[PDB]
Design a protein around this ligand. Structure first.
Ligand SMILES: [Br-]
Ligand SMILES: [K+]
Length: 416
């Protein structure tokens, strides 16, 4: 289950505790400079709550870069400690390792109620379980080595807060091995679990999935899992041309065609029938004579098809009108994919109108969840993040969850 996990706001005994917090600090760093601080700013609510409630120590563990299980100072977390300190208005102590007797002594020496950041977990092969040494030979951590590292992390504190939803799809030591009595979500993880639970567990219906993107093949697992849950599904973007060809023998010209994925289209449509899900594919298209925003364009229906040497790049006007009754009648919406080549303004109208309708439904009480990737980029570029119920920042963990896979870091949390 997703919605019954203990969260930071449920924890009663904090004053005087040593609190270990797993955070997501995987930010790009260029010769000691951090170019995007969004993920660091995102941790401030969890840190402030622990400070105000009187924690004796706030001990942060995280990873960045690609050390592959050896100490590689190109990927040191040191610059993150400086940036976090500037955002907090106080000094953050940075320690050169994350386990052992010297780390413990340095933690105990630190000022009461202060914040401490430990060095990159992935310097240790035991975090991921596998790695590659400096000479380039594969190394593997034994079951006993893993247990020892997890025990050493567990000795660091008294209460565990996991605020790193974006790593929770991994069976890594900091996700599954910190064996404290209280294991609770931080504010970011709490919100991810709250909204994915609302979408997948007991959704207010009708439940609609909006899917899109370039290809069929990478979306097969996502589509098949969502067909077990939803009432309706829009399928759009470049992947739609493969459906129209297989199902109706529609002429597609030079539009994108997914040969490997085409072989699974009939299985998808057959599962939609068996689960009583209504499918909404486009019935017209904006086509172009060149893969370019400046191309000559026109509109063709699915009865006309697309002539040789032209390519479809957005949903057409009738397809866009068909969005209205589908989206506005839905009370939960899961959106994973633009409906055309939204990076080219002349091929963005389908995606922008989809966004406007999702916002309208949300204002009238629907719950809207955006999965990530290009859809999140569209929302950000239109400056509409505050108009969607939840834009996930979980990356690969969000996709695995929507595919129906188990998240080890979520399973390991305490129950409410
Ligand atoms: Br046109
Ligand atoms: K039916």
């Amino acid at each position: 289950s997703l919605g019954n996990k203990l969260s930071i706001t449920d924890v009663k005994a904090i004053q005087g505790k040593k609190v270990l917090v797993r955070v997501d600090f995987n930010v790009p760093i260029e010769n000691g400079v951090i170019k995007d601080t969004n993920r660091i700013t995102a941790t401030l609510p969890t840190i402030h709550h622990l400070k105000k409630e009187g924690a004796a120590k706030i001990i942060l563990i995280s990873h960045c870069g690609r050390p592959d299980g050896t100490k590689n100072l190109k990927y040191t977390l040191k610059p993150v400690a400086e940036t976090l300190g500037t955002l907090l208005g106080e000094e953050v102590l940075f320690l050169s390792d994350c386990v052992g007797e010297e780390v413990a002594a340095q933690i105990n020496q630190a000022k009461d109620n202060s914040v401490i950041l430990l060095e990159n977990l992935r310097f240790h092969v035991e975090e991921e379980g596998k790695g590659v040494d400096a000479a380039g030979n594969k190394i593997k951590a034994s079951k006993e080595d893993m247990e020892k590292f997890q025990n050493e992390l567990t000795k660091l504190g008294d209460v565990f807060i996991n605020d790193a939803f974006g790593t929770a799809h991994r069976a890594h030591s900091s996700m599954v091995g910190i064996k404290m009595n209280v294991k609770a979500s931080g504010f970011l993880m709490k919100k991810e679990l709250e909204y994915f639970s609302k979408a997948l567990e007991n959704p207010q219906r009708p439940l609609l999935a909006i899917l899109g993107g370039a290809k069929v093949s990478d979306k097969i697992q996502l589509i098949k899992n969502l067909l077990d849950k939803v009432d309706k599904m829009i399928i759009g973007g470049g992947m739609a041309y493969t459906f129209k060809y297989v199902l109706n023998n529609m002429k597609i010209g030079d539009s994108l065609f997914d040969e490997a994925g085409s072989k699974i289209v009939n299985e998808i449509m057959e599962k939609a029938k068996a689960k009583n899900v209504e499918i909404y594919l486009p019935v017209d298209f904006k086509v172009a004579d060149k893969f370019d925003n400046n191309a000559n364009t026109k509109v063709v229906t699915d009865e006309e098809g697309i002539e040789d040497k032209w390519m479809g790049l957005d949903a057409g006007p009738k397809s866009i009108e068909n969005y209205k009754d589908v989206i506005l009648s839905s009370k939960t919406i899961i959106w994973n994919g633009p409906q055309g080549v939204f990076e080219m303004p002349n091929f963005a109208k389908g995606s922008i109108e989809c966004l406007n309708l999702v916002i309208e439904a949300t204002k009238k009480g629907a719950i809207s969840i955006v999965g990530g990737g290009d859809t999140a980029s569209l929302v950000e570029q239109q400056q509409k993040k505050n108009e969607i119920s939840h834009v996930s920042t979980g990356g690969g963990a969000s996709l695995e969850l929507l595919e129906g896979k188990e998240l080890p870091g979520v399973v390991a949390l305490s129950s409410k």
